[model samples]
Target chain A: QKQPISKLTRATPGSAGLDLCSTSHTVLTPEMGPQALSTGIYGPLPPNTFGLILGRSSITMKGLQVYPGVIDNDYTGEIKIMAKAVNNIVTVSQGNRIAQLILLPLIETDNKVQ
Target chain B: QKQPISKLTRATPGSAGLDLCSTSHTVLTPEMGPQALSTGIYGPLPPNTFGLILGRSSITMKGLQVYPGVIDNDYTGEIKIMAKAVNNIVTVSQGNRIAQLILLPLIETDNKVQ
Candidate 1:
């Protein structure tokens, strides 16, 4: 049996995003640039919806930066977060909430220049 | 009469965010670390919704970072972008879409432990 990413719950009812957790422990150093950390959360997004991977201040404020927070619906792989610790040794584990995923609706107003 | 932030539009039918433009021309140097740029756009968000300020690749790839993306609904100040260039001179104008705002719905299920 495989484990689902149910730990990606929010803090309160007024929260706007689902907390993203690492599947295991990972360490980051200043020398290591932006790298992807797997969350083992693989699935497809609903049609006309996308996800935004944002950094929580609890992590980002300590000099960790998440790169390119946009996520399209066509992606069907495990959600990986590209993060790096700036001049610090950062250790993140499944028990720690690393990032956030905000799912939003897409507008299909036929405005593409294709 | 005050101008509205109407230029914040989507590109395609499946776009999920509102492009945030600068109010005027600004320059980012390596020395300036995370400076705020005014958008001249201010308003209150509707109930149960919050804003996420995300960096566009057109800017972030060049080393601009958006800090603490989570924005509450009660904020009524001009939408300012905190960005800094890393070891480069980045000149951003109103024509350049720096970041994006993805407004998502917040679940208010009375989960607050007050």
Candidate 2:
């Protein structure tokens, strides 16, 4: 049997994001294109706040692109992670971290030409 | 002659992010790989906050990838927009937007196993 995937975590005391890990193994290929990978993480974000998805520095350096990571305040469902094929074939294992979620207070803005 | 690049702006009053536009024309190619395309934005971020570089949904749908958009509190250098080649050559024009920057509060954490 496979080991249980690790829960979301922050690697350091001053870290700005909570890590999102894969819950299962999956193979990605160029022919397959982009994917909305599943994350067991789910919940409602506080009103006036949103989640910004950012790629892990080490992961992106390897050519795997992560995307569509915006989690709106009203999205009350499972948190899904999106990514493109890693410029080549890659196998993802359970518990491998691919991205992070940073909760940011949605500071409303009246945008003016700058 | 090329027109002046558009200044950074939030699309609407309630918009949560500021769009980052290109300052010049560029062509991204797979053979050429990722490029740190320059932007005219520069300055410091407020204490206890960070700027996240996020992909524009429409642009990423075209297979062009954006990346490395983290802006910290102390960075005063010009902001750059990094992107990998489209699955094919894709030309970007001056004033074209490739990504958005969202300001997020950095809530410090004493992380524990959850």
Candidate 3:
């Protein structure tokens, strides 16, 4: 039976006082592995396999710019988090724990060695 | 006769050893002002008026990312230079003499007071 990974935890951004919905995980199904998993401002993934799509959507904040990252195939885990900030002040500093990304496995592909 | 600002000096990157064509002065023509001046790895502009479009497009060096800057309408100068660097090591230090951009005047609009 193809089992699923579980969502370990959720992340939050504090300094800028902005809130986002919690992100979860999903297993990369064979049909979904070779392409990008589109997360529309939020997501559409299985409970154990997951992805993150970051962008600057906050309009009221002055000079705020957002640039989220993507996860490659070889990564594994349960949670995926993104960060945001004002133009000059990085509410989330570099190397800080932004969000933890969770990876799900495909059925036929060889499991990646972490 | 509309005089064009002359191309004063050309800036070059010394550390990375990649060569680029020199940039010159250009006046942002009335038809061209406020729109992006397309520089296909270089440029298309008039004298005394100018624009810059920056992007990262250098390969061969490890983790070498390029991000150039754009010149806005209100700026005045004899040159516009963009900088490039290794993904980690910025070959041309920040604020170094990279390029000289010249600006030209548009006929009808109020001349921007420098």
Candidate 4:
């Protein structure tokens, strides 16, 4: 039985961080540097907050660098993972935790840094 | 003159986003696919929050993807940026906004997903 992001959600009162898992296994060869992996996770966010996806340290040690991800507050789509094989060959498996998602408060301001 | 992380700070009441700038110019040719760039912006955050750095869309449009970055709450060091060239050559310059940093609330739980 497979559960969607809405039904598979779990969050503790004190531990509110969310973990994102892969939907398929992908093997990145030297010839295939940038591979797009699906996480099969999708959901809506609060109006005042947005989703920020990050790479895990363990995966980074394997020469696989997950691309920095941003899901806007109004975005309602399945979360996707994009990674590049940096040092050598890398493999990403289904159900493997590929990224971490944290809900962050956002502010609309003109003090944007560039 | 060089300003350290301590004194170089600004956060508006409702708009609290920090822009990260590079300290040096680094050019990534097709041969040099992956490059580690330095964003001379680093600071300490509240214990309960961690820093989440992400790639800007403008840079992503150039085929340069910033690696998902994680800065621990207990870490007190300079923030760095790592990026990979996916399509063509990408050049990162000093004083250019390479990434965006956002502070997020965290949690500790046994609900780890893999």
Number of the top TM-score candidate: 2
lDDT of 3 by residue, A1-114 (tens): 011222122222111111222322322222222222222223334433333333212211222222334444444432234332222333332232223232232235577879
Candidate 1, residues B1-114, lDDT tens digits: the string is: 033334356754455667777777988886778888877766456667777777775466555666646677877767777787754678887767788776777667767766
What is the lDDT, from 0 to 100, of the residue A92 in candidate 1?
Answer: 83
Candidate 4 lDDT score at position A96: 74
> Candidate 4 lDDT, tens digit per residue, B1-114?
234445444445564556777789887765564555776555566668777667788888888777667766655567776676767777787878777776777544344343
Q: How many backbone clashes does candidate 3 have?
A: 33
Task: Considering only chain B, report the TM-score of each candidate against the true chain B.
Answer: 0.82, 0.83, 0.27, 0.76
Positional deviation of residue A44's Cα in model 1 after best superposition, in angstroms: 6.4
Judged by whole-model lDDT over C-alpha atoms, candidate 3 comes out at 0.29
Off by over 4 Å in 3: A1-114, B1-50, B59-62, B78-87, B93-114
TM-score of 3: 0.23
Candidate 2 regions with alpha-carbon error over 4 angstroms: A1-28, A35-45, A54-65, A72-81, A87-102, A108-110, B1-7, B106-114
**Which residue runs of candidate 4 sit more than 4 Å off their true CA positions?**
A1-26, A30-53, A57-63, A67-88, A91-98, A101-114, B1-16, B108-114
B25-89 per-residue lDDT for model 3 (tens digits): 22222221111222223333443332422332343243322222323333333222322232344
Residues A1-114, candidate 2, lDDT per residue (tens digit)?
A: 122122457989798888887778888887565666777887456668777777788878876667857666665567766776767887778888888888778965444734
